[PDB]
Amino acid sequence: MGYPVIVEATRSPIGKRNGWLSGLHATELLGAVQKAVVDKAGIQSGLHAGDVEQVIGGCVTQFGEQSNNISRVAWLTAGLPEHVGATTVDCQCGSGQQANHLIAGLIAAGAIDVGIACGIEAMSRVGLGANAGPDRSWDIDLPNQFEAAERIAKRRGITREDVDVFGLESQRRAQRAWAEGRFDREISPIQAPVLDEQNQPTGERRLVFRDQGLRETTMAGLGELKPVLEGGIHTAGTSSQISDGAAAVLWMDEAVARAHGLTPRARIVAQALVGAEPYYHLDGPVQSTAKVLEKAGMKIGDIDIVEINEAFASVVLSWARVHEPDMDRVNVNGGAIALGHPVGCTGSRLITTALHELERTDQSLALITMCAGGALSTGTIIERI
Amino acid sequence: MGYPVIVEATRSPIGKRNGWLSGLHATELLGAVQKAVVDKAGIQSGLHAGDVEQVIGGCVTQFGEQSNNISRVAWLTAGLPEHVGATTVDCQCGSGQQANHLIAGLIAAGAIDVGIACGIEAMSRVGLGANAGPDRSLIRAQSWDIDLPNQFEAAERIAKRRGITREDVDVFGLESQRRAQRAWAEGRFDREISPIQAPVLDEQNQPTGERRLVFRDQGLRETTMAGLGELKPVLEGGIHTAGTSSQISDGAAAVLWMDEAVARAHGLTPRARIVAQALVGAEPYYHLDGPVQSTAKVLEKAGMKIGDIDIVEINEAFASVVLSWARVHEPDMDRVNVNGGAIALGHPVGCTGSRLITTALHELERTDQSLALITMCAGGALSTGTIIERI
Ligand SMILES: [Cl-]
Ligand code: NA
């Protein structure tokens, strides 16, 4: 029955831990962006939020503020129409991306005509590991994310100098894109309650629009940062930042889009959520890229733009030794090192970044790929329309 | 691209709060049930665990044991191949049903040729509320304008709306126990259950060190109108007692989906299709009357009336939820929950959705009838509907 297309995509700016956005309840953050993508969309023709049929939102730590189907709770918090169905999903770091895969699915099945995929992570309000806790006081364990980043690094001959060159360029490329206002179209600025040094609301609610994570960065400077692991090569200036943010993409059946005055903007050429190798934990992008290129019938050379998530520099460097891409087409507006990584959101964020960059530069094809806790990886290939 | 169809479906028996399955890590319970639905398909064909491309699982209380994407942890726990992708989902009480819906889309999209929708809840091990903290209304924001009651309160509001007495729900709760013992004593669940190896526990809840095969639903109990009438309402002034509402349970279910082309290519009979699917919103004041809307939505998507449907599975969260739904849609009640519902069989929340689809399928097949409706109320004022057809 259906053919899914993106008709609109938007994101909050990404705030730092305890930064510009720590004053929003996670449900508000998400809800705000849910309404923002519907509002952006509603301009060309009369689309209203009750035209939406289902919402599917990635979120990793589904505890407290982020428990109880946040995709549903945000929708309602934001005062949007209660008839609209909502599901929240978890496949760690890829949840945000997976949400788009799933919404596409539903349209393809002719189950819905209009859906919103989104993702959220208010890592200031609800932090990593808040969803377990008691846990104690053949058959072996996944490394933790910092151990994996070093394992991946040893596997590929990736050196401290290598990853510092990377983190520096991530910072540079983001600063340039900010300077040029390349983010301006994708960003819905957000009203946030301002907290103080004591963590209490002043009265003010600033209008946040800039990604908080940018920072003057130097080869010399990076240079003296401490590894996070004893004996490791990853520092803080070469691994993504903990952040707050939310993102949202609005999908339609192309014919319904076309019939009610909305312009289709992109389709999915191919999509995947694949397993990775437990030992390396986060090398998943090798696997997901391989699978979507394979399905698409394409080679890395056919892809104009790649968003691969800078969880850690080694991950990306490791994925580049395997698929041998042109580094000038990978993370062109910088990435998570510079801009931040609010885990549940990132996957919808990346799709959002890439679509706008294909639109800005008038190019055709983008690859989106992320590694993910529990040794998963998500990949997508989108084609501009 | 794809035309998605169920080739196999299986479920654990359902175990009581602290009961026959409480000895198992939530992950082990799903893990076993995931492994089992694959196993069943391999008996007819070459198909094995690594042919599955993705698993999607439902689970509501996504804390501790049930956290960090239990769908994946479970798969890995059962020793199944690591190359398979996995995601866990939450649309509350419908999660297990939506998981099915979602696998079907990924097939329809041509994303995958083979997938598993499953569901788990080990309420023995992880209980309602364990995913929020102490002050249970710091999960909203201090701008919550909507009147959304707790589930018990909701069942009583629906009850008042429809004029449902303490007699009616006690009449209802008895008939579920009666149908569930009749289905069981007839071995109606035999094809659908795959028996689960479980540790035995002592009068405390300590493992004796003996394994056992569990094969029956623990919740069947002797019930009489008298006995039902002596039970104390969950809420003061309420009509619902422990006898006319579902039981906190452990269980899991899983359904194996394939493209139709790939199915016949690999030797397997398609068993059923989705005719229509929905997840929709409910009136928040009533909270749990959603089945009324989802039944309406899927009935329309399909082009049918209630009267076209051979059997219904509507979840018995509360007697009044079902009676409210019947009083609005006017079904033939002998065709509703024909083998008993969650009052008698139990309600392992995240699993029930796949459980209802597995049960529903199996009754069509056992009766050579055509159409089934599965509908469920869910927390957050939601409701999943599915119309499946034997194919
Ligand atoms: Cl009945
Ligand atoms: Na649905």
Side-chain angles (χ1 to χ4, degrees), chain B residues 171-177 179 316 322-323 333-334 336-338 340-341:
Chain B
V171 158
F172 182 89
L174 170 86
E175 178 60 11
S176 178
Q177 268 291 1
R179 301 195 188 196
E316 296 168 3
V322 185
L323 304 169
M333 281 286 327
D334 310 338
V336 169
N337 296 353
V338 312

Side-chain angles (χ1 to χ4, degrees), chain A residues 54 106 111-112, chain B residues 98 101-102 277-279 384-385:
Chain A
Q54 274 193 45
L106 288 179
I112 57 167
Chain B
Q98 170 81 318
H101 292 184
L102 290 176
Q277 63 169 284
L279 166 53
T384 54

Side-chain angles (χ1 to χ4, degrees), chain A residues 156-196 198:
Chain A
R156 309 285 175 196
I158 304 178
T159 71
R160 168 62 172 271
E161 182 182 62
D162 284 346
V163 311
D164 280 0
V165 163
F166 194 92
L168 172 70
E169 175 74 347
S170 188
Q171 274 289 1
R172 186 189 82 73
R173 268 151 171 233
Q175 284 162 47
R176 180 185 62 205
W178 263 105
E180 264 149 60
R182 311 197 186 164
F183 292 120
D184 284 4
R185 282 160 304 140
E186 74 194 59
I187 281 164
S188 272
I190 293 318
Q191 274 210 116
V194 171
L195 306 187
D196 61 11
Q198 276 74 292

Side-chain angles (χ1 to χ4, degrees), chain A residues 25 27-28 53-54 56 62-69 72-73 76-77 79 82-92 98 101-102 104-106 108-112 130-134 139 142 271-278 291 295 373-376, chain B residues 53-54 56 62-64 67-69 72 76-77 82-92 98 101-102 104-106 108-112 130-133 139-146 148 277-284 297 301 379-382:
Chain A
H25 187 282
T27 61
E28 305 167 314
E53 266 177 280
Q54 274 193 45
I56 298 177
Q62 302 185 18
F63 189 72
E65 292 190 7
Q66 294 186 350
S67 61
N68 291 263
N69 194 4
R72 178 52 168 172
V73 179
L76 297 177
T77 280
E82 5 158 287
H83 68 271
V84 180
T87 297
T88 297
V89 306
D90 170 7
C91 54
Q92 313 304 83
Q98 181 54 319
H101 297 171
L102 302 172
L106 288 179
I112 57 167
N131 54 349
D139 205 69
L142 297 184
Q271 49 145 312
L273 172 61
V274 310
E277 316 171 284
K291 190 156 201 270
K295 265 158 72 81
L376 305 163
Chain B
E53 291 181 69
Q54 276 196 55
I56 300 169
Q62 307 214 13
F63 189 76
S67 75
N68 269 66
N69 186 2
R72 170 72 160 172
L76 298 168
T77 284
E82 36 271 273
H83 69 248
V84 189
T87 299
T88 315
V89 314
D90 180 349
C91 55
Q92 298 288 116
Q98 170 81 318
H101 292 184
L102 290 176
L106 274 200
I112 63 180
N131 55 347
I139 60 159
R140 274 138 184 248
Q142 263 132 52
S143 43
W144 195 258
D145 74 290
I146 312 169
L148 189 70
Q277 63 169 284
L279 166 53
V280 312
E283 330 157 68
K297 178 130 155 184
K301 297 274 278 108
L382 281 190

